[PDB]
Symmetry: D2
Subunit: 259 residues, 4 copies
């Protein structure tokens, strides 16, 4: 799975590090950059899925097991990529947990855990890759955002608050690191069809279909987005074709955020 | 006692207002302004001597609670006590924050966690605490203090600016989550506010203070310095019935500094 | 009709100039500022309605007939207010025409006419009031905006494009005039119930009610906004309580723009 | 012939692209970049000698039409001619504009009207002209050239910045109006782009040019000057199938100058 027929020569050999890379959207990033000839390291909690995917993709892929709550382990993972391949060229902060939770019912421990799996690792990963980027004079960071806080969507307050945090963090880190040659942008998907979003309804295909159609009806473009649409955008945001873009959101949502 | 405005909002009289970080700077100006409108104002602060001092000045319609907002249990205890004394909160202002500077490369996990606790976490928990009483009544208002710093991509204080950007999003989603219960939530987003605390920080460099002040004036569209009263004027409006149809929105009081 | 029980001493005696002031939202502005003790001049195409309203409100109101397409006449109207009462303190650019029109069917003459009635007069009114404001060292301008272009609403492309134009014009005029002491903001309503929005369905009360309920269902707050909600916000944006606010949008829409 | 990128978009081959203000500066870079991808590129310009010159360089997959975009009849005639030659437009880029400076107090009605005609009106009429052919096919893309100038509240060019803000809104509403017919509309929003035309304007003040250039670099987050190729890189992406799910959106290429 190439995800596109477009060919970016500027991606060849680049070292790309993707958190949450073994399944879903992060898997599509891993696949797309490997297809462009990048050297792609990815982290995931699921060791069996990660190992499977790196074995399938071969030697220009590198899977490291990592719980992104564990910042020591995250830094260990970054140092290991650096020792294997040199400074990271492209970091994609993608790891997230989007489970539904009622506002009235969130405990302090729940809040902490969700901020940690959704927001904290993205700061520490940027902090880890930065010195290597600055030594070279170039690098790019892509924070996965979400239109859900833009549209004020209820029922997952920690996830949407974390994603809004990353919106801010892109803008300030863009200024703080830009003088070192690092560009930082957010890739902000709409409602992406995934095997996991679909697994949730395995005995209500009426319900799945109805919910899918509702997104199509609300969207401006009348087809379902998928992980390839996200990977198309990530390739552009990593390539030299976006060398002067920083501090910005790039939204791939078929119009769902403008209703 | 300082009024902050000559405007009179009859809709503010008797309302129960709760302001975190209320004993100094901006939060102090909110406490003063609502007391002057005849509200029943409870406020939280770490500084007990400052808190006790401010409540001494303002008298019996003010109520000072010692609270470390990092302690969520104590935050909820503070809210429960206000409720038992005065009835459901009408107006919550999430104002407590810590804006110390810190280079990205210097931030440890411990520091990050502590700043998220002081800057962001309490604001959710306070809204969570006041909401059920507001919903029982059918009405209420929440003001999250935001900041133009993340909009302007300001460097060198990543934990503060990231917490502030977080609250921008939390305003929008809680506005949907609670609107059907009659609660409106908006963010009050100040520019560069002159305070005695920001000014105490240069007490041996008057040249430097004045230079920095003028730099704000030159960057701003309006050529005077904003102060705490400007923030309090806006807060009275966001709490009053004059803003009853407004929710999920930023209201920015910054003399144009965010548009340069 | 006071529109509020709030009392702004800083509005007393201020000279307020409102375009489209004889009916609908602009009428509510005229009423609210007269109640605060302002000296309120207003312009409208409807001379009979304008004369009626100024006669009812008495001597601190002043109605001038004006077709806002006619910029000569607009400037004449401004000069006359200035000669009567002195420099304008508060300008509200409110005149607009929001009729529904299909994209596919707009002619060049239609486009021109709609840009002229929706956008052009707001620039020329600001330009007319500015020198008087600057002489004094203070003044405020409120451009009526609209959430319709934010929500990408179709079927009235000239109206929504004009309102988006005014969004920009607020920001740039705020910088260009701010050094003279003039603050410029946009007041951006959501779906405001008016006698005119309602007159459109005088034999389909089912249809009116259904459409009203649809706004309530989409809104975050579950009640209909009306012209008083807009006038409450205008009073604040004109008063000294907003002296340091400029360049900004203030949206009064019950959450309709965030869905 | 200048490629602007080494990237290869097979989805651009044979597509029919139509660019207003195409014979100089940025629009010239778009014309060049799409020709290099194997598109069939028609472009409009007032400057016939410049247009004829550029089409001479680029050869038979380019097509130069003399057009004053103030003449809506001629604009529609230009579109009809492309359609009869090559089939429905796949990609429209609304790029023609005039960015001359003008103090607010200096603007006459005649000037305002003329600048709205040159900066905004044609963009609507071009989208209107290309839309039915795009809808018959089921697909198409529109790029409105926007500007960070109104976002940054830049003074002294009110007609230009107001027209640009207009196009920001027109992107969002046309995206809803046409999306169901398979057409996506987005705005490409450049920062301070170095061009031979912006540079010709200082040919006797090299100090002044360099000073102004460095001021952009100091204000930007990225410390190099953007050029027309940066805009063209972004346009290829917004026209290609790689952006097929993107619509109603701004894509800003400005090295951070809009966030200060």
């Amino acid at each position: 799975n190439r995800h596109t027929d477009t060919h970016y020569p500027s991606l060849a050999d680049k070292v790309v590090l993707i958190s949450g890379g073994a399944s879903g959207i992060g898997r599509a990033f891993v696949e797309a950059f490997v297809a462009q000839g990048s050297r792609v390291a990815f982290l995931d909690l699921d060791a069996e899925a990660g190992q499977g995917l790196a074995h399938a993709l071969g030697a220009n892929s590198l899977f490291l097991p990592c719980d992104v709550r564990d910042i020591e382990r995250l830094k260990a993972c970054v140092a290991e990529v650096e020792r294997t391949w040199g400074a990271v060229d492209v970091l994609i902060n993608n790891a997230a947990r989007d489970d539904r939770h009622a506002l009235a019912d969130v405990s302090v421990e729940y809040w902490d855990e969700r901020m940690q799996t959704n927001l904290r690792h993205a700061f520490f990963a940027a902090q880890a890759v930065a010195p290597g980027m600055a030594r070279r004079g170039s690098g790019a960071i892509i924070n996965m955002g979400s239109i859900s806080w833009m549209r004020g969507r209820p029922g997952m307050v920690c996830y949407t608050t974390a994603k809004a945090a990353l919106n801010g963090m892109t803008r300030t880190l863009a200024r703080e690191l830009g003088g070192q040659g690092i560009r930082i942008n957010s890739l902000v998907p709409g409602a992406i069809r995934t095997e996991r979003q679909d697994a949730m309804w395995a005995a209500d295909p009426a319900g799945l279909e109805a919910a899918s159609q509702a997104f199509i009806d609300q969207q401006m473009l009348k087809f379902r987005l998928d992980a390839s649409d996200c990977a198309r955008l990530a390739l552009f945001l990593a390539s030299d074709d976006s060398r002067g873009c920083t501090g910005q959101n790039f939204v791939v949502d078929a119009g769902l955020s403008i209703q």
